[PDB]
Design a protein around this nucleic acid. Structure first.
Ligand code: MG
Length: 80
RNA sequence: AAAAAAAAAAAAAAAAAAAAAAAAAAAAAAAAAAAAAAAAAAAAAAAAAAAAAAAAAAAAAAAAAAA
């Protein structure tokens, strides 16, 4: 007879949005970069960001339609 | 002086009651009266009376991605 509770009722860390953390450390192709958030550009409600992920498939399948499991993907790249 | 054994094996034996013409009664309206194996012998399952079965449930997808 206990109730459930959400993390929206809680207090969440956000600073990983406001920094980078990566174990590659090469950080090359330094273009107009994956520029880090600060709290002047802190995220809001109702606001919009764009997002695009590129995928790769990792599964071998069978014929499956003829009158080893059906192929599914995984993520390869993300640009937000 | 018709005076018989007084019951094995749970023996064995009673009935717990009638046409009534007693008086001047014709010839089946019964509802059906109705026996044969035994030479290695007769042999339904499904669930069992259609006294009224309309019986295509629309379709159309121009095509993906994901640079
Ligand atoms: Mg596409």
């Amino acid at each position: 007879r206990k109730p459930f509770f959400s993390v929206d009722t809680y207090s969440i860390n956000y600073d990983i949005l406001f920094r980078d953390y990566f174990a590659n450390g090469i950080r090359d192709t330094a273009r107009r970069e994956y520029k880090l958030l600060t709290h002047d550009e802190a995220p809001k409600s109702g606001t919009l960001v764009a997002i695009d992920a590129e995928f790769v498939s990792l599964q071998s399948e069978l014929c499956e339609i003829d009158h080893i499991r059906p192929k599914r993907t995984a993520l390869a790249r993300i640009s937000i």
